Design a protein around this ligand. Structure first.
Ligand code: 796
Lengths: 20, 337
């Protein structure tokens, strides 16, 4: 499921701002 | 009317914008209790004001770290903008000052935690829950955009939840007062409008796209474009194909299709009717915008509280002694702070 795919990704924690 | 309230809000802002407060406190007036979060170039700490007993959140910005991320103007914008604005859904900057090592921004303490944390824990919000938060962002941007400010960093990590379940928008590190177009590639990858990724030059409409990402994340429990690396994310945004969960109502899909719109002649918020294209959408039919501004709508969620300087709605971070160097660092860079 998309949910399960998210939960398993490395991007579920607080997400850093980028610049460039 | 909004028009007339915004008029008088502008006059209020410009006075402060032109004549900014500077150096209205000092480190030793505050007792430092706990770290509530950490960022590129510093931390935010719960502190207690010694002579009032008032609790605050104190953002400490390492000047040297700021300089090496090339964020000097960005940091001057933040403090310049935050002392000048005034709206229910924006953090309140009470004090600011600096020392040899750091900048400091002392803001009203918001005890209920970040949206991010409650959203990850429970999974997703119901559409009515998600709508109650969205409305508040809709109004905040109508405010900011009216002062020619672009916010540039909407995401649950940046929305603090107060005692009454209402939002405070925190972190103006990328907010900027600009009338024309601007170019800086900044924000957070999942939230970037396609025109930012493509280095076209862009405007306030990137904030309306970011609102589409947030409404979607709040209701689905994950964002419309995710992958393990940023580059992977940018490809998905530039394709721009969105799939919606089977549980999204018709109205929500339709509001989102108009926010997450690559075509700027077509993006809601950005058209001739401006924000009324959003406020009068069917998904917001139940919303009373005035009661929302007034804070008289009952919050769908009240964070749990236990007392004045309680921090359980925030995560735990490793503490670090605040060192102030005996030499002044980056004096001229931060003169106006
Ligand atoms: C305003 N009142 C109040 N009350 C309780 C808690 C908090 C905060 C917790 C994390 C915050 C933040 O802005 N964090 C940034 C999120 N994008 C990350 C960041 C960026 C720069 C620096 Cl120096 C520190 C941090 Cl934590 S603000 N604020």
């Amino acid at each position: 499921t998309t949910y399960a795919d998210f939960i398993a990704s490395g991007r579920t924690g607080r997400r850093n701002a980028i610049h460039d | 009317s909004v028009k007339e309230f915004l008029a008088k809000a502008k006059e209020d802002f410009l006075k402060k914008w032109e004549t900014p407060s500077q150096n209205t406190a000092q480190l030793d007036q505050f007792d430092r209790i706990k770290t509530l979060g950490t960022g590129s170039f510093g931390r935010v700490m719960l502190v207690k004001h010694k002579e009032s007993g008032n609790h605050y959140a104190m953002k400490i910005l390492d000047k040297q770290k700021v300089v090496k991320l090339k964020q000097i103007e960005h940091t001057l914008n933040e403090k310049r903008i935050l002392q000048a604005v005034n709206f229910p859904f924006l953090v309140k900057l009470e004090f600011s000052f600096k020392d040899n090592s750091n900048l400091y921004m002392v803001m009203e303490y918001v005890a209920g935690g970040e949206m991010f944390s409650h959203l990850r824990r429970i999974g997703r919000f119901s559409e009515p829950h998600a709508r109650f938060y969205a409305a508040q962002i809709v109004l905040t941007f109508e405010y900011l955009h009216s002062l020619d400010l672009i916010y540039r960093d909407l995401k649950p990590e940046n929305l603090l939840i107060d005692e009454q379940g209402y939002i405070q928008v925190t972190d103006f590190g990328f907010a900027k007062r600009v009338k024309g177009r601007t170019w800086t590639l900044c924000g957070t990858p999942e939230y970037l409008a396609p025109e930012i990724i493509l280095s076209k030059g862009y405007n306030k409409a990137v904030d309306w796209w970011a609102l589409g990402v947030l409404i979607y994340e709040m209701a689905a429990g994950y964002p419309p474009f995710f992958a393990d690396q940023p580059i992977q994310i940018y490809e998905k945004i530039v394709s721009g194909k969105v799939r919606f969960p089977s549980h999204f109502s018709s109205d929500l899909k339709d509001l989102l299709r108009n926010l997450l719109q690559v075509d700027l002649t077509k993006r809601f918020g950005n058209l001739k009717n401006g924000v009324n294209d959003i406020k009068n959408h069917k998904w917001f039919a139940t919303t009373d915008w005035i009661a929302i501004y007034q804070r008289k709508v009952e919050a769908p969620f009240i964070p749990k509280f236990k007392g004045p300087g309680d921090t359980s709605n925030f995560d735990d971070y490793e503490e670090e002694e605040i060192r102030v160097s005996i030499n002044e660092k980056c004096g001229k860079e931060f003169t106006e702070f």
